[PDB]
Subunit: 314 residues, 4 copies
């Protein structure tokens, strides 16, 4: 019953072109409510597509909320669907491999089963899952939506029935967004358009410079030459996005050495802000010689000068 939460909810619902949106304390609380809404509806089975986000897959794997998950590849989602399947969870691009998922194909495979798309790294600026047929669109507002991640958040833009169902869970589960945090998110939402466009354009140029260096074997980025065999860019995505994932030829040995030599680019577990970030998945808990990268609002030449110098370690 807060005003700051309502203004942020309708702002994101309009951005995603959804009927309404429901805001929660964190991204985890939004996923929890969506899962609990399916369980309460007498439909606790979830067909989740892998790759999926680190914290989100713990929720399904443990099955704390009384959920049963059957991991299925994108190509065969329909086969995994059971009579009690209530949701089809899918993250695009497939974090942290950055593989593109055809949302139109996923929705047709699900049929009468609602599809939940994690549009966290894409943002409504670079992807509209609702338009492809996704019933629900999940967000972890901390990354990109807020811009700085100082205020945590989680929101699902969906149709009226699923939104009412989510609000009912929120009512007794109590995972509410604080008005101060919602205010910071709605403030950052005004500049989302210019931030994602600038971060995507600097990421595209950065992706070209990374593959040219012999220190890394290849770098994953949808916008790169031949890294979109499906033709999903333009049809589904605005561009290549602001996420770069690269594989080092030196393996785990060169990965940790490359991270410590970076001065401008810093290391963090949560990624997706105004500052450029890197995260070694092997050095946190994925590939051993794999390094993740979230592109910020810095000058492309300043980032390239720092990454190339750190790669020169070998």
């Amino acid at each position: 019953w807060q005003p700051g939460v309502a203004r942020f909810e309708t702002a994101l619902a309009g951005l995603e072109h959804a009927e309404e949106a429901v805001a929660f304390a964190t991204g985890m609380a939004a996923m929890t409510a969506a899962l609990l809404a399916a369980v309460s509806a007498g439909t606790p089975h979830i067909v989740a597509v892998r790759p999926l986000y680190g914290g989100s897959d713990h929720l399904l794997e443990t099955g704390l909320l009384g959920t049963t998950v059957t991991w299925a590849k994108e190509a065969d989602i329909a086969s995994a669907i059971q009579d009690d399947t209530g949701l089809v969870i899918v993250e695009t691009p497939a974090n942290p491999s950055l593989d593109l998922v055809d949302l139109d194909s996923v929705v047709s495979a699900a049929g009468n089963v609602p599809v939940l798309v994690d549009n966290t790294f894409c943002t409504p600026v670079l992807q509209q899952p609702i338009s492809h047929g996704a019933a629900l669109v999940l967000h972890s507002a901390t990354k990109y939506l807020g811009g700085h991640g100082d205020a945590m958040g989680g929101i699902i833009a969906t149709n009226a029935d699923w939104a009412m169902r989510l609000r009912q869970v929120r009512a007794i589960t109590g995972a509410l967004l604080h008005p101060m945090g919602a205010y910071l998110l709605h403030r950052g939402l005004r500049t989302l358009a210019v931030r994602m466009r600038a971060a995507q354009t600097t990421a595209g140029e950065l992706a070209e410079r990374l593959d040219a260096h012999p220190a890394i074997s290849v770098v994953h980025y949808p916008g790169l030459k031949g890294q979109d065999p499906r033709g999903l860019l333009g049809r589904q995505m605005s561009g290549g996005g602001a996420m770069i994932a690269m594989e080092l030829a030196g393996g785990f040995d060169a990965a940790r050495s490359f991270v410590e030599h970076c001065n401008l680019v810093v290391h963090a577990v949560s990624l997706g802000g105004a500052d450029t970030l890197i995260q070694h998945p092997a050095s946190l808990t994925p590939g051993d010689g794999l390094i993740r990268l979230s592109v910020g609002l810095e000058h492309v030449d300043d980032l390239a000068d720092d990454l190339i110098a750190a790669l020169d370690a070998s």
Copy 2:
């Protein structure tokens, strides 16, 4: 992983004399986490003592979190305890009737089963359930702890094992307290001692004035003529508390007329803060002619003047 949350957690743990405390977005989120922690531990049965708080009983009644509840009277809790019972939920004084529950007797009846006590209206100022043997002490920080209800909250002061279990649920459930909200709660915690003492002393005088009026049949307030037959005040409670329940002789007809005639005392769903409030549970969704009154910081004389004049108009 927030600083403002940690400082509020340890402040309340010290007030309740518990090993540590775990803070959640709302009171509902704390109860949800406690219930989910019991379910995850392979013990989903809950022996709850009816009466219970309005929103808390819905969580058990629906059994959204995979819980099985067996409502039992205080006198026979031990009999209702099954092999899979993980918690004994009990609110004292029994909202809304304000019936006193002997915590020492409840803990002995539970035996090896952890006891969760809702100390929301009592606050650590007027009741220490931990000292009586309660394993967990739940709070809805919105009422009394914060002082104004501007910042929502929910916290459980408990031993290290249950606190670690609650933190694990919080980690994937994501029902986190916003640092701004935690700051406002910790700020209000400094003045909790002088607020509850002043509210309790003005409620004790108000309870005497209400029973004297012929408009109401009986007034429920622990610190009154023969209203404490168990000898729980002094032994368990500091005084009579700041809550007063009252049943109007006119039934529902005079009860709603008493609410609409009140100008100073406000009609609200949430009750407990720096102001005096009245709630009619029969008009809201309990008994037909029962009004619940949360004593505030106002002067006893001017507080009696508004209530007595509203009673004069049926």
Copy 3:
């Protein structure tokens, strides 16, 4: 033109019984605006009463705003009033010696000259200078008004002409109160009545226990028998207030040793909060063996047990 500032302004104006109030960023900004309003009115002379607050006297002494000050004793204010005198600045009780000033006598001496009273430590709860004839009442909102001092402030409760004059200065001087800071002050204003009453009652008992100890020569608290020869308590003040000053018999040697032995009471430059504070003017920049004390909301017995133990150790 902020909403949070307006609600705090009218709340304090009502507390002080003034027509309206003007809020500034800090206490210094309020004094600066009052001084600049007098200078702009073609009346830059100020008759200030000694003693005065540390930072406020620097403003007059330097004469940065184009002011000419004539420091005068309470007894001969009328004689120091020149043709161009626009204000009579006076703080009561005289910080830091705590000497009571008869406001009724000061106003009669000033005559047609407006009187500005620093009611910071007294608060509208324990003193109403407006009722005695003071044209303006200055406050440093951080101390006592806010309760914790987390949000800085400065406000002057005065008549419409002086308030319009102050608003005009604020308009081009730009020393505005931030709405967030004003919100925290207005929130703390709700509990001001119960906090000052509880801090005053605990200070009165603490002063009796302090004089009894042979470690200190003379305790200073206008309230203890004999420390009010003018009969100002009751007539002007509510009680003795929450400020206790004292002089150690051991001089500067015993003064610093007593401060380090305190565990519950902490030392700070700014005072007037929920926690009990102590301040040594000699060890900060007055007398060599003199200590200051801001009584908080702690239990009188808990404060006396720590203070007496610290006094015992020289």
Copy 4:
């Protein structure tokens, strides 16, 4: 002595390439402190360039702070400088006309007199006055620096001597920035680069479409059709900025009619945010048929379609 203020101060000092910066409550407070620092230094004369910001010229015109102003054109600043001149105030581009001022020429004309440049609309993104020889650079942080104007501000990036002088004034004047407001400004500073670049690029396209319409006589936007005869763009400015001034051929009659027909672009006194704004100096208090523009983060096709349609209706 606040943490949030210090981090914002050093961030802006680095952006402007100044030794240090001093932050105040509002832009007016920063100008007031700069003027008071000159007055206190025994140098109260100010040579200000005509034209100047609306509120800033009132401070000099009234001479509240004990200042004497001699308004002079850019071409003859040196002649207006007297023995007691302590500052040379200059705004570039000269609002409202948007005329470019050669900072290198102004600094040479001032010689030993410190030069204060109001870089509010240019921001460190599009102009570095420090590099041209300006001793002080004033900002009204509300406009552009914050991005939304929700948190007010004022800051001067200057050398160590002038910064120490400003801090000394701030110390007794008390026009402090609230930490919450400073936090919002420092948060918005991270996105300043992408916001000013995007607003400048859409303003450059907008000015081309405005001059083509016969409703307006001549548009004022630095570097549109050889509107920069001095060669100041590139040498001093990054581009044309986000400000466009325009004179209607219909005079005051067409000026008010064009404002009411606008739906997307809104009217306000304070200008410089994420949203596009228009202002009529004649209808507020300059030329009779002149309007200004604060280009925001909207798409150029959305702004042009709205402005051209409003121009069609007189």
